Amino acid sequence: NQQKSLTLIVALTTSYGIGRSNSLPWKLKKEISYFKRVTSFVPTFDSFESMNVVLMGRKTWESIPLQFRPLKGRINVVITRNESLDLGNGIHSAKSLDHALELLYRTYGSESSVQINRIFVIGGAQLYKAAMDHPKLDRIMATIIYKDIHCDVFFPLKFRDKEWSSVWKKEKHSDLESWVGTKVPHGKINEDGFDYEFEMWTRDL
Ligand SMILES: NC(=O)c1ccc[n+]([C@@H]2O[C@H](COP(=O)([O-])OP(=O)(O)OC[C@H]3O[C@@H](n4cnc5c(N)ncnc54)[C@H](OP(=O)(O)O)[C@@H]3O)[C@@H](O)[C@H]2O)c1
Ligand SMILES: COc1cc(CN(C)c2cnc3nc(N)nc(N)c3c2)cc(OC)c1
């Protein structure tokens, strides 16, 4: 199994809402744009052999545009308990997060050209819940949507509330850009009627 640390990436409203009717209820191409630099930024040097992995629950699998997947230039994995089958041309399915890490280790690492850098959990609500309970999850890359938009799916942990202030801490913007690479919009950003912000949250293992 594991070695390295997991990163969770999410776009939620101040009330923890993350979905509605199996899609992510807003229109943000600058915020969708950010999910890509994050999810695929491997340091210039290692950039030769190293590729990032995004992990996802099947619904999200589904919820991702036909045109958009499999997410390019990242090993794509899907977590589905009842691994029925899986259409793909080199995309895995794993019974859990745990099985998924064992599948990547076994598969890569060894007699491979392909090495993994950073491992991401992109969702959904079900997979988010299991990564939050994983001893290896230490960081949350969160976009905050400052609107009380109607959702039917919620982030399972109020990580930003007082109840969790001795475990998750909001890091400095400078260390947010230092972790991604690229320069990232400081403050409040407004695109399509909404005000949002980029935060990086970290916990100690
Ligand atoms: N705002 C955001 O950033 C954001 C990001 C991602 C998702 N969301 C949204 O959330 C919605 C989908 O959320 P969701 O919670 O319903 O679905 P999900 O986790 O995306 O898909 C759920 C399925 O995936 C598998 N799965 C998830 N956690 C698992 C575990 N611990 N062990 C085994 N299988 C697990 C199971 O699949 P089987 O049924 O195949 O066993 C479970 O029914 C959509 O609106 C999606 O777009 C929002
Ligand atoms: C092109 O790549 C995609 C990926 C999705 C997957 N998805 C539900 C989604 C969307 N935005 C997100 N934003 C941030 N910060 N974090 C996430 N975890 C996230 C997840 C949907 C999509 O169609 C518009 C395009």
From Swiss-Prot:
One of its GO terms (cellular component) is mitochondrion. The keyword Oxidoreductase applies. Residues 5-203 form the DHFR domain. One of its GO terms (biological process) is folic acid metabolic process. Substrate binds at residues 31-36, 74. Pfam families: DHFR_1 (PF00186). Pathway: Cofactor biosynthesis; tetrahydrofolate biosynthesis; 5,6,7,8-tetrahydrofolate from 7,8-dihydrofolate: step 1/1. It comes from the Eukaryota. CDD domains: DHFR (cd00209). SUPFAM superfamilies: Dihydrofolate reductase-like. Coiled coil: none annotated. Key enzyme in folate metabolism. Catalyzes an essential reaction for de novo glycine and purine synthesis, and for DNA precursor synthesis. This is Dihydrofolate reductase.
